[model samples]
Target: MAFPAGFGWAAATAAYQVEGGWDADGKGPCVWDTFTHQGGERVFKNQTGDVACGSYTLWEEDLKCIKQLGLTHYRFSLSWSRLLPDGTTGFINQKGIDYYNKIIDDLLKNGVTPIVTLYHFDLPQTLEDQGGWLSEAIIESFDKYAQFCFSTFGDRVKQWITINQANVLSVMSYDLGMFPPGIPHFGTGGYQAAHNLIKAHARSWHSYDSLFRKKQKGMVSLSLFAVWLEPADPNSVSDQEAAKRAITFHLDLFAKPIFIDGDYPEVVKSQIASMSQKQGYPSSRLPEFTEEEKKMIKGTADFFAVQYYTTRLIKYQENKKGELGILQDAEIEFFPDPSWKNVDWIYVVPWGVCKLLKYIKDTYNNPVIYITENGFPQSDPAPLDDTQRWEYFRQTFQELFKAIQLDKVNLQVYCAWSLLDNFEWNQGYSSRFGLFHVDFEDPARPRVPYTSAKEYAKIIRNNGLE
Candidate 1:
């Protein structure tokens, strides 16, 4: 895939990770705020994001960094708690709106496009306390909140991502019990929560498309972190089927409803039903979509925003059956190829990205796509020479080029996972996945560029592999 004329190349970040106001200047507490407080011990050094990169106070400096890099776009998320302090209509934070407005205006002034994400797992604490996505009320609340953003920032923000990685949010929160409001109910509550999130995203997309698109002339969509699956063995059909099942369980749980019509994949549904029956459940735990819901969710996005990283080699095992894994009770085994470098649960498999893009194109009819988040992590401090990180970028881009130019996929934009290192969820500050290193020890949270920053700058300027 040849790079489109005037296509964008940039990096992405979230408000909670970078803009660490916490409760400063009347900013309300997000679920992360509370999570960090209650679950800080589970984090690295019991650290919290009380003052991350201090971007809340250093927006100008951040923009300066982007300008210096010659980035065409800067993708960031809006802090829902900061904007709607109470997560309702009772109170509106003017200061929060002003902060974002200033940042957007500054980006535009510097000729950088601001790609806005309405929610990036930073719900107001009040919402989590009030049942969060587990409740149907969350759908209406998110719709209203998204409308507020559209009406407020719609003029300056032309590209809007409604929700970031809804599948991750649902699975992490409800199944894995790692994120806020963690509940260990897989295949039922988690599935329903994911179902609700998809509905909410579709609702928000339509709200913007119907109410604000014509006036604002902006585009809206959801971000999904796609995982590619390969057979554990080269010649085993069962292994190939297992790989497909893993991918479907992970990605299609949410993608199918929004991109390929409604309901879970038939293979996944049957597997879950069989498992549930064997587990002495009455019926499948997954929720059934109504006819109206199906129509509403189908074709909800103008373009697909994909956040990809490592791939998994999957194989089915008859003996491996016990507790459910992270997302749901979907059964499978994962292994990393020995040739790839390992980073905890993630493995370096750049070719997985090409496979995923091809799968999306062949399976979902090739909608316009954007590489929303793709990067590797290194556990080191400033003055760090990130050769491995740069290599990851280079190899990933090589695969991306193959997908676009040779495979003829319509991938339009590519955004690095992040610009500056900040608070990583659960891992806290233990992991670093930024081209720019941030000094947490310093009160100023100074950002120093790494070698990958220079490499990425060149790639963005050239608009392709150099």
Candidate 2:
């Protein structure tokens, strides 16, 4: 697969997962730190990120991995609590600032573009204690954090993602209680949480555009988790419509407000309101954005950043027999590409990436796009063959090439899901999505290069495949 000229090959990681300095360098407690430490809950094997990959202690090695992969860009998240020991305080941690400064400097020094994310599921635990995503007050607090990063590190980091996987984070954390800020509920909580995230994202975008755009010339966008959906029963119009509604409810809720009009997707507003009424509520379960906010958020992003892993089969669960959560509110049920029983959400569907890119191009008016996260996950112990993973990458990149050459999507940056195997959320370390695998059992926490990693480096160096 051939890429457009000047396309970037990259890899990605989150702060909490890769950076082992949970409390090192004066870093405060993120929700993951608290959630995993407190124990007695969702995480697989009760594992924690207290010392996941030790990237914090050995930053130079991760840098070498980027250089080793011949990547032109690297996308990673910042630990919010690392910067602001307490979430919403004016007291700046200068050492925390210096830690990132060195990272950006070193990345550039190695000829790599640093694409950074401000919030990547790792919110300060203190903020979660203070109502977290549930409160509108988080808007100002989040804006301040963004401002600090923009004012401090914006010049070096030209690409910024205000929030990573906003839809998934909101839905999972609030509704499923499968992740941090474990407030398990069915109706309304996710809707409300997603509302706050949209506002906070808009606020951050505006701040960066106003203050840093002149000097930094950076782009701000949200890294939305784009899980492509196909109708399970293709002949059934209801099933097809169900798939469309699923897209509107998940991706459109985030993209429409930023990339298209300054409002929630029409279907989203109507469905939530209709569902709420049917469920005996006076108002829509989904929150409303004010006119001022509508304008503020109308075109907040300079580009679209997407995280695609797998595709889902959607159906009109016309008869609602299950819990009335966000997924059900769409009147949709997601089945993972007719895969194994355990895998509910992920299946190796390469063309789904192209479908998603075309959807963004057609729907969002042809914005510059990036695949901020994309990779195949393997079960716990690192694989020796990894032949399937290599094939998945090659096939996925082919679809991405078609999106560029045939569909003419203005997508440029492409990042594999991760560089190192680290502490995965909730499921703990049982799930691995790294090209360069990490050995957890060893005290050294050594990084082992998988066959896929070597193949990726060759793909990057050659810029295409045979």
Candidate 3:
């Protein structure tokens, strides 16, 4: 706290998960809209986000929630379809622009800096029809969309994030089939999606730099899912190398091109090429970038927005007889901490944050970083005491403080996963990652600030736990 003269406290929420005016204000269809409404989405109890959180009409209430939490920053995303109702390369919806302008203006009025994310898992379904993140054509479309955002909102927003969990979106959406735009391609199509995502990020960064950067000064970054793949057998060289491979494919796939060497990690290319050859292919399952694309993507990011929950202990134990793909190519398995007391998705490992921050420093030369989403979740019907969340934050801050004070990672902002409880993708409303709880059963969708919210406010008001 003493070291950081002007640190920011942010609570994050994506537009698709929070904003419930699905079709309002000339908003067109996004992939999530089609996935949830048109079926195939496996939300808890088959629920839809048709009226979740009611943030569309109740954004002012959300703004009040931000002020109540004593946060200096509000990290929220804009829905693409909302602004361009016909999707990218389409008509501009002034009503959609007005809605976001109002939110941004009010946030400014309240003295909360808006850290806007350009993409958070939702894109125009119209683009998906043209092959989503798998197509090379998307690079131009994404650039156009990003350039539009910069031209429109770059006046107010200083911090911009290009993608949220870019790796997770590629893996889960295309490989695992657990989320929307599910494809279940694991190795082949997933790599293609990840390839395009990297390009999309660089394209957006270059667009911001080339077009709007000088006039409306702002920063654009790629948010990543950072996992510290620890060795299950610390003394075993096999386990150690396996963990390294996991980083190459899982984390480095998006990171290397932006911060490090400006291209896919060589290990990733070699491993995928070898696996593809074994799987009866002439080319690698992962796409190859031309020299021009490689040069363009290099050094294109201003910062890194990373989301980390827990580190996994990697030990190779996959089915050798199974098909070889991006995930299977690692030949590694993850062991979760047996001691994390949280219910699901989240684990208790405060030190993991320290290790991850150090790894990023060592690997990417200590790029500017923001913890875009780190949260402890409980079941939906749980009590609001949330003392575990408080403890989680306390220990988490200890590790983050060590990274800043000791490790000297260039960490700037700390944004909790979400400001309020809303739609939790596959599980829908069953999971809660909010600093404040929302009563989803009520049409008013009332929000009750959690006890952890008070603790966080105290930390913010005092500058640190001390």
Candidate 4:
């Protein structure tokens, strides 16, 4: 598959995951900082990102690695708490801003385009303590933060991603209670938090567009983790419907409101409403958007950013009494396919990437897209010959090529999962998804290239599969 002229390849990372200056240089604590160190959560092997990759101090060395890889772009996120320190406009941390500014200047000087993500799961702890996404005030705070960033860095960074995986972080943090600021109830606080986050993203996007775009000539958008679902059996209608619901519940929950015009997906609304009714709730806990809110959110993005990882097969089960089972009513259960590679809950299905791109094109009228994050994680460390990782990239890019060349999907850019191995959130340092491996045990935080790095560099240089 051939990429368009001037199309380039890049890799991405988040600040909290890589940079380990949690409380350094007057920086305030983020949710992850507290989450990692609070009461032995068993999230990692006595591990915290407090000094993980030491990227905050060793960014120069990491930039050397990027230059060696022949990368055209490098994408990284700024910690909101680090920048604002208190999640307000009154006080901004000059040290944190200077660190990012230096990195941006260094990248530009090295001929690498900087793709900056304004927020990547590291909301200021002050905001989290003050109700976080559950509070509507977050919209105002985020807008101010975005405007601040645009005014400061928009001149150098032409491509800006407003928020990284807002729905995933919101759902996991609020609904599943798996991440920081964990809240268990799915119906009320969880969905409410998600609704507010969607609005906040829109507010941030518009703030950038209105304030910076025309003069700066930059683009702003949000990144979503697109998880595709397949039917358990090819002929089962119940299983097919269950698969559709799974997709709608995860992807469309946020995409519909921003990309497909307005409002939550009907499937999501009905399911949440039915669940709320059964639970004896007075009304749907998912908050409703006011007319003013709708007007503010409508047409908020210049493009859509997507991260496709693995796909899962969904099955619908029924009881012997012919009653729909709880799993079916909930709309999904894992199909347990032995053919696919399994990493926790994620099942590898590269062809599903093509299916997902096609679905987005048909469902939302082929909006401009960026493959914001896509990579496989391995438990092994620093494999000299990374066959599995290479295969993962090869197969996924094949599907991406099919989507663009054959299907004519407007796929603009593709960013590999990461440049260097760093701290994964709740999973901690266990999940190795980076093309380059970082020695966490080493105080110097040396990054060693895995075999996949060389392979990836070749792909980037050629602009596609060789």
Candidate 5:
């Protein structure tokens, strides 16, 4: 089996997950720094990303790993705090600018295309103190920060992701209270944060279009986490509707504004509004966009990028009387099948990605789909001969090829979830998703390629299965 010609193969890493040097060279603290530093049952073993993979200093070695994998592209996020210490352009860190420039130059020198995500969950701690994504205040700061990145790095960077996964960021951080800037506001907070974040993304895109696009020629979009939701029972219309509702709430909440229409999905608004009314709330928990705001947000993304991990089986569940949260609002229950093979939370359901790719194609007019982050994870003491990881990739790639060839999904790129074992948020260092293992105990943080990495490199060289 072989992939189409010119199909891109790559691996990904986020700044906080990989690059340590938390306080190095005029860098400011981010929400993750504050969260992990609080040091009480938040992260596993109270682990922090103080010297994660030491990528801040070992970037050259990372580039070598990229080359060693024979990847066509390398996707990594830039630290907003590192570049603009206070999450503003008022004080530029020359060292941060120089650091990213060196990496970009080296990647280009080595024939690797660099795909940069502007923000990846690490909100500058200063901004979080002033209400973070939940407030409209951070929108202006984010716009300025994004424009600064474009002005400085747009010349070299062709593909830019404005936010890593705004939907996941909103819910995980605000609703679930699992991620940084932890706030357990149930039904209301996630929507508010998402509302502001979508606007911020729109502003960044418009800034690029108006100011930078004419000269720089770069593409911008936010990545979404796409977990395929299959109805628990095929014959039950209630279960089918339940699955659709979950998809609308999880995927379309963010995607509808930029891709389908310039507003939240109607189901999202109506359900939340109805639920709020029943709960005696004066207004809907889901915020609305002004006509002008909608116009600005419409058609903002150049393409659709998604990170697919696993699948969820959804069944219709009547909302418990007086229950309040996103789950309650959606009126659905979802979980992985008990029989599906898994590691941690990521279930090995390769067909789910194919289904998701097809869904995106059919739903959003078949825009180019970029698989930004997708990989399996293992627990501690991860082995060099990672057969399960290799099998996971093998199965996913097979499904992906079918999606492209049979379903005609416009997927052009597939970047692996990670480049090296580094700090995983909330779970901290427990969940290992890297193709290259990093010995965290060693000061050198040496990255030794796993068998999966070798297999992946061969696939990249051959352009598909051999």
Candidate 6:
């Protein structure tokens, strides 16, 4: 399964998940910091990321793992709270800047390209206090923060992802009440939050284009979690349309505004509007974009960054007029096949990645794609001889190769979901998704490479599996 020449390989980590200097060096609290601290029944065992991986001080070890895996790139994120303690430009944290600067310099020293994500589900609590993504204020805040990063680190970071999995951030945090700030605004909140996030990404991309592109020569985009939806009954027209609606509501919710058109998907808007009208609301639960916003958002992404994990079968369900929110609005039910194996809850379907790649290529007009995050997760105390993870990678990459070679999907890079196991948000340290294993109970937090890491190193060395 050799891949095309110049195909890139990498691994990723979010700042909040790995860098556990919660309040070190003037770092302010993020939503997660507060969410876990006040955990009534939130995180697993009420585990907080206060000292999750100790990567703030032990980042050198992480770099060694990247080198060991022979990664062409290493994707990491910046903590907004660490950079601007209150999510404002009133004061700058020079120490925080210095910390990232050191890592960027070290990555280059080792010949590993650095891909930086500006925000990855860790909003500064100060901003969340004032309505967070529900308000339009965070757009300006995020724009300023993005500009600061471009000016500060853009020279070293040629690839910039504006936000990681904004789909998950919006729906999980606002709609599902699974992530931070646990809002649970089923019908209205996720859409509004996502609307603002799309605008924020546009604002940041435009800023990079106007202010930093000439000097920086970097690429900027946002990451979307792509769960390829299949029809529960492949031959049923209703089931097929149900799959379409689910994809539109989930992936196209964020992607359409950036890639296809600078507005919400037609199905998404119409469905929600029809639902909202019946629910006694005058307007759609999905927000509308002004003409200016439409233009600004269109063509903002340099490449499509997809975080694909699994696929699910969807069936059309009658819109329960009595209900409201994302699931009800889409009027679909998603269930995994009983035969599919899973790591925790992420069902593995290798063919789904191939289909998703083709769908992105065809739907988005052949935009350059980056598989930003793709890997299997395991519960804690996983084996060093991780045969399951190894097989997952092998199967996924085989399909990925087919996508590129046979389907001609314009994918250039593949980043494994994580470099080391860290705080997995609501699930906490209970779930592990790492090529290298880190023992949380170990005071030193020693990182040991699983067998998957060795196999991945071979893939990187040969440029693909053989």
Give the Å shift of residue 165 in candidate 6. Answer: 0.6
- lDDT for position 406 in model 2: 95
Evaluate all candidate structures by whole-model CA lDDT and list the values in order.
Answer: 0.83, 0.86, 0.84, 0.81, 0.92, 0.92
| TM-score for each model | 0.96, 0.97, 0.97, 0.95, 0.99, 0.99
lDDT (Cα, tens digit) per residue for candidate 6, span 3-57:
8788889999999999999999999999999999997978999999999999998
Ranking by lDDT: 5, 6, 2, 3, 1, 4
Q: Give each prediction's root-mean-square deviation over alpha carbons.
A: 1.8, 1.7, 1.5, 2.5, 0.8, 0.9
Among all windows of 10 consecutive residues in model 5, the one with the lowest summed lDDT is: 174-183
- Worst lDDT window (10 residues) for model 4? 319-328
lDDT of 6 at 188: 84
For this target, which candidate reaches the highest lDDT against the unseen true structure?
A: 5
TM-score, predicted candidate 1 vs. hidden true structure: 0.96
Cα lDDT tens digits, model 5, 297-398, are: 999999999999999899999986959999999999998888899898888999999999999999999999899999988899888999978998999999
Q: In candidate 2, which residue pairs clash?
A: none
C-alpha displacement of 28 in model 5, angstroms?
0.7
Give per-residue lDDT, candidate 2, residue 375: 88
lDDT of 6 at 19: 93
What is the model-wide C-alpha lDDT for candidate 3?
0.84
**Which residue pairs in model 5 clash with each other?**
none
lDDT of 2 by residue, 1-466 (tens): 7666689999999899988888887889898888899789578888899999988787888888888899999998888898899985566677777878888999998899999999999888878888889988899999999998888898788899999999999988898877877878787888889989999999999898888899888889898988889999999999999999998888999889887778999888987788888888888888899999899888988888998988888988863653577877788788765453322246788888999999999998898998999987788776856987788889888888899999999989999988988888887788888888888888678887889999999999888776
Question: Quick one: RMSD of model 1?
Answer: 1.8
lDDT of 4 at 434: 84
